[PDB]
Design a protein around this ligand. Structure first.
Ligand code: 6SN
Length: 273
């Protein structure tokens, strides 16, 4: 069973998502993260290609967990009487982007460009797999410090991607779009672009732009740090009040600020090593 298959290490973190432990797969010593989610705390349920009742998080992770290293991979899952247990890949050494920005302050634009580009590629992978993350933020991004590779985590607030309106949201409010705040309605892709604007501002300024609902609704972006005109333009574009005024992923990646991105290994060599 699960208890013999894995060696439990220390608790890495806990919160709205549940409890995550460091671990080692006993067969090949592979580093893993063991996430526990109480059944009574799971509101969104779904079903696998076969039809088993599992948390939506398990459905979404299976849909995105293949080849590409931009999303944390689900290695296995187990059902207990009162909880679900998820075995996830664990990079080592690792640091989440929130901790990284807290320690190092506002990121140099070359570093933010590399990081932002990788988040965009990861989000595009999710969308191509029919998955909407809904909680893109610094806390949900892991940095593989040796490889300079970023990984999206916590699909616990996610949903299957659709072209119709979403009327439910349980992600982070300060990353949520004005249409959600005002009307309790949003479309997946344009809401994801808004959160990407919040994230980019956070990378280059060292803090999020808006705290209150009134600020989100006004959508007036003030720069507290020195940020290039091209970067400011891209941020203000992702943060357009009207969802239809926001750039598509293609338009973000073709933006003049996004040109000449460093490869992840070059990024680790210059900024992380
Ligand atoms: N899909 C996921 C992935 C994680 C996760 C959180 C924290 C760590 Cl240190 C790791 Cl390795 C993974 N939580 N939920």
């Amino acid at each position: 069973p699960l208890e013999s298959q894995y060696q439990v290490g220390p608790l890495l973190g806990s919160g709205g998502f549940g409890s995550v432990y460091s671990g080692i797969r006993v067969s090949d010593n592979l580093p893993v993260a063991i996430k526990h989610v109480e059944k009574d705390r799971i509101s969104d349920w779904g079903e696998l290609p076969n039809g088993t009742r599992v948390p939506m998080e398990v459905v979404l992770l299976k849909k995105v967990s293949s080849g590409f290293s931009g999303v944390i991979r689900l290695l296995d899952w187990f059902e207990r009487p009162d909880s679900f247990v998820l075995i996830l890949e664990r990079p080592e050494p690792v640091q989440d982007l929130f901790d990284f920005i807290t320690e190092r302050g506002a990121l140099q634009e070359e570093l933010a460009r590399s990081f932002f580009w990788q988040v965009l590629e990861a989000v595009r992978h999710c969308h191509n797999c029919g998955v909407l993350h809904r909680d893109i933020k610094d806390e949900n991004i892991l940095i593989d410090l040796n490889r300079g590779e970023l990984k999206l985590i916590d699909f616990g607030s996610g949903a299957l991607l659709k072209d119709t309106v979403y009327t439910d949201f349980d992600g982070t409010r300060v990353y949520s779009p004005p249409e959600w705040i005002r009307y309790h309605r949003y479309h997946g892709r344009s809401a994801a672009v808004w959160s990407l604007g919040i994230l980019l501002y956070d990378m280059v300024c060292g803090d999020i732009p808006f705290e209150h609902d009134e600020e989100i609704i006004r959508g007036q972006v003030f720069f507290r740090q020195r940020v290039s005109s091209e970067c400011q333009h891209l941020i203000r574009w992702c943060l357009a009040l009207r969802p239809s005024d926001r750039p598509t992923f293609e338009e973000i990646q073709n933006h003049p600020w996004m040109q000449d991105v460093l490869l992840p290994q070059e990024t680790a060599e210059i900024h992380l090593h």
